[PDB]
């Protein structure tokens, strides 16, 4: 492929910085684009760069272009959760409508929240209608901790961040449920749980 | 002694295409580029002129990317402008260095055997022959700054250099001379006479029938044909009833002394 | 469009038994795709060389085919077919 | 932005004729059609310089007609599982005059799923789960949980609604559905979603919470030969009231 990106994927705490790489062998060279594509959505154009420009700044994004070495990089300042997405490098061979486009496989960027005051806990929520059809909620835990989803017995959801804008408060959570004798102490035996976690009795 | 770079691009269907080039220095073919081969082929040892292996390698690359680039551009314009295959694009550009003054340059291109556009000054321009829907293609080609820049650097800054390198490195051959053998013949019937001259160089020559020290028009000069020696051949003829007359030949090989024959 | 001007000739005048070169000059034709077969009594010659295709100032193409042929009191000719040529065309050699 | 696509979700049987609508409010002359397999890169299938300009980019069985500037409909004469993928439509400001080739603008995309049979399509079942009394007293906040299970395919749009108004703050939804029986290619999915609110808000019994799932499935027109209820495109909800 004429366009290679690096790294393949990376994870970073919000507030921190990062720099995505892109190296092309496309010839001749006309211009370089950076697309941001959120999960299950359309690729959005961040910046366009002609060879005459070595910098194009948009918001917290700044993209540099070096036509000599045939590489471009995209800096992201003060990362925030909304930055989690696939970043695509796009190169054009012609400075006209007569130009073909080359797309990179993309770089997968995930931004975890920085939890200053973590308070790990496992709760049990009862259904609002039926009985008792419950479900387990693992919430308020450091992004350092990790909980994975592919078992068909008991079910565990992927860790997910929700942000309460009003209170400037962000929290992690993971959901586990089972159709079978099911206890909360179990469902979450299974991932690294901060040794300090509240529990229901 | 102009340097003529010729390109021939033929597009059978949207599928198949071949593109070959050549470089004439005056009347002598110097280089030839084959569609198949990657590298340009030098026909004369003094071809690469004064340029280095480096300087040359750069230039070769440029052409390599161009040939491909060009080829797609056409195939695209074809779609864009609704043109129909088969297509025949030709290109003839270069320069001629003047010892006294600055050198002039030219970049012409023809579509289907007809001048269409050229490069003059800082951009592209359509010939008086090309229709009003070509303005499109022109508008597009002109949007492209980098190419235009490069094209200029070649005409005003590259070709000329490479030509003075050739003139020097080729000085000795371009100055060579070759005396042509000459003879007369009967020929086909109108009774027309024939005056043949063959195996000379350079190309400029003078052949005419005349019955006296004062020649006469009505001598029909044939066309000047080539031999694998880069030498040339020529037939001058005349129609008449009136038997006695002669043929003369003026050239730079038979220096000072022309050639005369009789009957 | 254009149609090829065929002209068959030789490098030196033909002295039978003495080896010589037989040239065939095709010009003024368009477009560029062309078939050129040198003949011997109506028989294609396998070994022949040709110049690089080229075009004049008027954008017409010209080309040169040739081989080393020892003449004999053997008929030679130059067959050519083009887009503008209904059937192949042959141009005999005059000695 | 100013570019449109419909439908965003489509599941259809083999051999059926499909057309993906695409429209731009901008006067862009150049338009592209891309095919994007999950995890793969953007594949260029069709492009147009302007009205009456239709050119193939990969050779697909698809066709693109442009009889008008603002419309760029993509059509498939006969559907086939190989066509399953996401289809994006784009238009560039490219052309005319500027100090740069106009940037590209993409649409919301359209994920189509082609099947041999439609017998495996299931609407989702939804449930809301009230906050734990323990959570409240500890964190002084309350998390409702929405669970949507047993739906196929995974064309779905979950959304929370508080007192009639759709909310976004406090909401966290699973990145991707998870297979219920991951050992089979045709498996039904489950999907989770969370909503956190101040313990104060949740303790007001007149505060109403509803999480709904938009399920994209068959249409009234589709043929249905089975016993259960036809899995047509539909909404499925679950509600909860605050309480002390
Ligand atoms: C029917 C109408 C027909 C009209 C036909 C058009 C007339 C002929 C015009 C042709 C122009 C097309 C040429 C294509 C562009 C070629 C540009 C070029 O000549 O590239 C040089 C190459 O060597 C670049 O090397 P690289 O390694 O990729 O680096 C390039 C990086 N920059 C400098 C370009 C930014
Ligand atoms: C597309 O055209 C290619 C070349 O066709 C040519 O026909 C004449 C004009 C000559 O140029 C001859 O040398 C070539 O064959 C073909 O190679 C190719 O098969 C053609 N495609 C199809 C399927 O027709
Ligand atoms: C495909 C075009 C080839 C034309 C022949 C050029 C030969 C080299 C000449 C370099 C002088 C500029
Ligand atoms: C005929 C040669 C043209 C080269 C342009 C880069």
Euclidean distance between CA atoms D162 and D145, whole angstroms: 13
Phi/psi at B55 (5° precision):
-40, -45
Q: In the numeric block, which tokens belong to residue B220?
A: 């029909």
Q: Which residue has the tokens 């808000």?
A: D201
- In chain C, what is the straight-line distance between the N-terminal and C-terminal CA atoms, in Å? 32
Partners of chain B (3+ Cβ pairs below 8 A):
A, C, D
Ligand 2: nearest atom to the Cα of B12: 2
Q: Taking the CA of residue A157 as centre, how many other CA atoms within 13 Å lie in the half-sphere pointing to its CB?
A: 31
Can you list the domains of chain B with their CATH numbers?
1-175 (3.30.500.10), 176-263 (2.60.40.10)
Tell me whether chains D and C touch (3+ CB pairs under 8 A).
no
Q: Which fold has domain A114-201?
A: Immunoglobulin-like (2.60.40)
Cβ count within 10 A of residue A185: 10
Nearest to A37 by CA among A68, A71, A82: A82
Q: What residues pair up with D171 in beta bridges, in sequence order?
A: D195
Distances (CA, A) of D192 to A159, A176, B135, B147, D127: 11, 9, 59, 55, 10
Distances (CA, A) of D74 to D17, D88, D217, D222, D228: 11, 10, 21, 21, 34
Euclidean distance between CA atoms D150 and B16, whole angstroms: 54
Before D153, cis peptide (omega within 30)?
A: yes
- Residue B212 contacts residue B262 (beta carbons within 8 Å): no
- Residue A122 contacts residue A22 (beta carbons within 8 Å): no
Phi/psi at C53 (5° precision):
-60, 140
- Residue B174 contacts residue B218 (beta carbons within 8 Å): no
Q: Give, using CA atoms, the residue closest to atom 11 of ligand 3.
A: B159
Euclidean distance between CA atoms D87 and D108, whole angstroms: 9
| Ranges of each domain in chain A | 1-113, 114-201
Q: Which residue has the tokens 């001598």?
A: B219
Euclidean distance between CA atoms D222 and D118, whole angstroms: 9
Q: What residues pair up with D60 in beta bridges, in sequence order?
A: none
Q: Would you mind telling me the total number of residues written for chain D in this entry?
A: 244
Can you list the domains of chain D with their CATH numbers?
1-116 (2.60.40.10), 117-242 (2.60.40.10)
Proximal ligand: closest to the CA of B12? 2
**Determination technique for this entry:** X-ray
Phi/psi at B64 (5° precision):
-50, -55
Before B232, cis peptide (omega within 30)?
A: no
Q: What residues pair up with D9 in beta bridges, in sequence order?
A: D111
Is CATH 2.60.40.10 correct for A1-113? yes
Pairs from D70-74 (Cβ < 8 Å, separation ≥ 24): D70/D23, D70/D24, D70/D25, D71/D21, D71/D22, D71/D23, D72/D22, D72/D23, D72/D24, D72/D31, D72/D33, D72/D48, D73/D19, D73/D20, D73/D21, D73/D22, D74/D19, D74/D20, D74/D22, D74/D33, D74/D45, D74/D46
Residue B227 CA, distance from chain mean position: 16
Q: Binding site: what residues of B are annotated?
A: 73, 144-147
Count CB pairs under 8 A between chains A and B: 25
Q: Binding site for a D-galactosylceramide: what residues of B are annotated?
A: 73, 144-147
List the helix and strand counts (H, then E) for chain C: 0, 8
Strands of B259-262's sheet in order across: B206-210, B246-250, B259-262
D176: left (phi over 0), alpha (psi -120 to 50) or beta: beta
Nearest to B225 by CA among B189, B244, B199: B199
Q: In the numeric block, which tokens belong to residue D105?
A: 């603008």
Resolution in A: 3.1
Can you list the domains of chain C with their CATH numbers?
1-95 (2.60.40.10)
**B131, exposed or middle or buried, with CB in 10 Å at 0-12, 13-18, 19+?**
exposed
Euclidean distance between CA atoms B59 and B147, whole angstroms: 15
Q: Is B173 helix (H, G, I), strand (E, B) or coil?
A: helix
Helix, strand, coil percentages, rounded to 5, for chain A: 5, 45, 50
- DSSP letters spanning B21-70: EEEEETTEEEEEE-SS-SS-EESSTTTTTT--HHHHHHHHHHHHHHHHHH
Crossing angle (nearest 10°) for helices B145-157 and B159-174: 30
Q: Which residue has the tokens 């508008």?
A: B139
- DSSP letters spanning D69-128: SSB--EEESS--GGG-EEEEEEEE--SSS-SS---EEE---EEEEEES-STT-B--EEEE
Geometric angle at alpha carbon D192, from D190 and D196, rounded to 5°: 170
Q: Which residues, 6+ apart, have CB-to-CB distance to A25 below 8 Å?
A: A2, A3, A70
Proximal ligand: closest to the CA of B11? 2
Q: In the numeric block, which tokens belong to residue A70?
A: 């045939």
- Residue B78 contacts residue B86 (beta carbons within 8 Å): no
Distances (CA, A) of A174 to A185, B98, D131, D173: 14, 82, 14, 10
H or E segment to which residue A184 belongs: helix A184-187
Helix, strand, coil percentages, rounded to 5, for chain D: 5, 45, 45
Nearest to A74 by CA among A52, A102, A112, A45: A45
Partners of chain D (3+ Cβ pairs below 8 A):
A, B
Nearest to D78 by CA among D43, D114, D109, D38: D114
Euclidean distance between CA atoms B124 and B104, whole angstroms: 17
Q: Is B149 helix (H, G, I), strand (E, B) or coil?
A: helix
Q: Would you mind telling me the total number of residues written for chain B in this entry?
A: 263
Q: Give, using CA atoms, the residue closest to atom 12 of ligand 1.
A: B70
- Fold: same for A1-113 and A114-201: yes
Nearest to A199 by CA among A118, A116, A119, A117: A119
Pairing of strands B220-221, B232-239: antiparallel
Euclidean distance between CA atoms C69 and C40, whole angstroms: 10
| Widest distance between CA atoms in chain A | 69
Q: Which residues, 6+ apart, have CB-to-CB distance to A159 below 8 Å?
A: A145, A146, A147, A172, A173, A174
Q: In the numeric block, which tokens belong to residue D52?
A: 């009456």
């Amino acid at each position: 492929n004429q366009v290679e990106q690096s790294p393949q994927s990376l994870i970073i705490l919000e507030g921190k910085n990062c720099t995505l790489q892109c190296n092309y062998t496309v010839s001749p060279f006309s211009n370089l684009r950076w697309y941001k594509q959120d999960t299950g959505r359309g690729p959005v154009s961040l910046t366009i760069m002609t060879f005459s420009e070595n910098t194009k700044s948009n918001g917290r994004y700044t993209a540099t272009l070096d036509a000599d070495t045939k590489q471009s990089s995209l800096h992201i300042t003060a990362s925030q959760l909304s930055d989690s997405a696939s970043y695509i490098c796009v190169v054009s061979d012609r400075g006209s409508t007569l130009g073909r486009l080359y797309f990179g496989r993309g770089t997968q960027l995930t931004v975890w929240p920085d939890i200053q005051n973590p308070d790990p806990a496992v709760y049990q929520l009862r259904d609002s209608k039926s009985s008792d059809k419950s479900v387990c909620l693992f919430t308020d835990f450091d992004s350092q901790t990790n909980v994975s989803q592919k078992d068909s017995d008991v079910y565990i959801t992927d860790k997910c961040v929700l942000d309460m804008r009003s209170m400037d408060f962000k929290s992690n959570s993971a959901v586990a449920w089972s159709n079978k004798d099911f206890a909360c102490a179990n469902a979450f035996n299974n991932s690294i749980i901060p040794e300090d976690t509240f529990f229901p009795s | 002694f102009p340097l003529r770079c010729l390109q021939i691009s033929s597009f059978a269907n949207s599928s198949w295409t071949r593109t070959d080039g050549l470089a004439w220095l005056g009347e002598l073919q110097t280089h030839s580029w084959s569609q198949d081969s990657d590298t340009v082929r030098s026909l004369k040892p003094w071809s690469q002129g004064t340029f280095s292996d480096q300087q040359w390698e750069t230039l070769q690359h440029i052409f390599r990317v161009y040939r491909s680039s060009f080829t797609r551009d056409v195939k695209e314009f074809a779609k864009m402008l609704r043109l129909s295959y088969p297509l025949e694009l030709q290109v003839s550009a270069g320069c001629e260095v003047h010892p006294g003054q600055a050198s002039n340059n030219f970049f012409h291109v023809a579509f289907q055997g007809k001048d269409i556009l050229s490069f003059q000054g800082t951009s592209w321009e359509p010939t008086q022959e090309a229709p009003l829907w070509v303005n499109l293609a022109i508008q597009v080609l002109n949007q492209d700054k980098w190419t235009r820049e490069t094209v200029q650097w070649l005409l005003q800054g590259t070709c000329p250099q490479f030509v003075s390198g050739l003139l020097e490195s080729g000085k000795s051959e371009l100055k060579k001379q070759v005396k042509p053998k000459a003879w007369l013949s009967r020929g086909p019937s109108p009774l027309l006479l024939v005056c043949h001259v063959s195996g000379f160089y350079p190309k400029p020559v003078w052949v005419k029938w005349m019955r006296g020290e004062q020649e006469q028009q009505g001598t029909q000069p044939g066309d000047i044909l080539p031999n694998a020696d880069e030498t040339w051949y020529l037939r001058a003829t005349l129609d008449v009833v009136a038997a006695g007359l002669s043929c003369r030949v003026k050239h730079s090989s038979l220096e000072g002394q022309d050639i005369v024959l009789y009957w | 469009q254009r149609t090829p001007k065929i002209q068959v000739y030789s490098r030196h005048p033909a002295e039978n038994g003495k080896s010589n070169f037989l040239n065939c000059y095709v010009s003024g034709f368009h477009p560029s795709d062309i078939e050129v077969d040198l003949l011997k009594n109506g028989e294609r010659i396998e070994k022949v060389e040709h110049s690089d295709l080229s075009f004049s100032k008027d954008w017409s193409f010209y080309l040169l085919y040739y081989t080393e042929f020892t003449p004999t009191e053997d008929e030679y000719a130059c067959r050519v077919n083009h887009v503008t040529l209904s059937q192949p065309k042959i141009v005999k050699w005059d000695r | 932005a100013d570019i449109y696509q419909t439908p965003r979700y489509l599941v259809i049987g083999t051999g059926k004729k499909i057309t993906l609508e695409c429209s731009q409010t901008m006067g862009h002359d150049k338009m592209y059609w891309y095919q994007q397999d999950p995890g793969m890169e953007l594949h260029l299938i069709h492009y147009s310089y302007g009205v009456n300009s239709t050119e193939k980019g990969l050779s697909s069985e698809s066709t693109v007609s442009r009889i008008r500037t603002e419309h760029f409909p993509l059509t498939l004469e006969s559907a086939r599982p190989s066509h399953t993928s996401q289809y994006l439509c784009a238009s560039s400001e490219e052309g005319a005059l500027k100090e740069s080739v106009g940037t590209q603008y993409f649409g919301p995309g359209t994920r189509l799923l082609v099947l041999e049979d439609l017998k495996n399509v299931f609407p989702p079942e939804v449930a809301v789960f009230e906050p734990s009394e323990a959570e409240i007293s500890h964190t002084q906040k309350a998390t409702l949980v929405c669970l949507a299970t047993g739906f196929y395919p995974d064309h779905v749009e979950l959304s929370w609604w508080v007192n009639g108004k759709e909310v976004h703050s406090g909401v966290c939804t699973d990145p991707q559905p998870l297979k219920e029986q991951p050992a089979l290619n045709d498996s039904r999915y489950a999907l989770s979603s969370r909503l956190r609110v101040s313990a104060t808000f949740w303790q007001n019994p007149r505060n109403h919470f509803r999480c709904q799932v938009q399920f994209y499935g068959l249409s009234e027109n589709d043929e249905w030969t089975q016993d259960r209820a036809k899995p047509v495109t539909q909404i499925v909800s679950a509600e909860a009231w605050g309480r002390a």
